């Protein structure tokens, strides 16, 4: 299964939730409509119900470099970001575990394929920081 230091971890599923719609008052860019889009992040428990992702004390969205100040930091669940843009792009979402337990770079794809869509990612989380272990208890076994 896992090996070495990675044995002392548990897995959680986080769900990234994306929404987007066209802003008609914003002029299209080269005929492409400008859309308002939003990303949020939740945690899933052992039953698959959505609970606040309190296991992170910080989330940073690393946006495409066409945005001003493309690295956007949020500290409260659900770490909701909102922007306007003309194009889809892969972006990295850095999530920072409580108690400096570690940064995880989760691959997201911002796209306009649907009005809304959800994507799940499995992350490994260590069990050696008491406050994080205690918080992890709310979303499933540890």
């Amino acid at each position: 299964g896992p090996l070495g230091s990675m044995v002392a971890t548990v897995k959680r599923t986080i769900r990234i939730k994306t929404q987007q719609h066209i802003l008609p008052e914003v002029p299209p860019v080269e005929n492409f409509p400008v859309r308002q889009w939003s990303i949020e992040i939740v945690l899933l428990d052992d039953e698959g119900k959505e609970i606040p992702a309190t296991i992170f004390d910080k989330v940073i969205y690393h946006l495409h470099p066409t945005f001003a100040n493309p690295n956007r930091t949020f500290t409260d669940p659900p770490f909701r970001i909102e922007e306007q843009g003309w194009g889809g792009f892969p972006l990295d979402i850095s999530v920072f575990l409580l108690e400096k337990a570690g940064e995880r770079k989760i691959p997201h794809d911002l796209n306009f394929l649907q009005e809304s869509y959800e994507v799940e990612h499995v992350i490994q989380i260590p069990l050696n920081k008491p406050l994080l272990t205690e918080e992890l208890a709310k979303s499933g076994s540890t």
Partner: peptide, 7 residues
């Protein structure tokens, strides 16, 4: 809906 940027 398939509009995308570069990298």
């Amino acid at each position: 809906q398939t509009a995308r940027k570069s990298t």
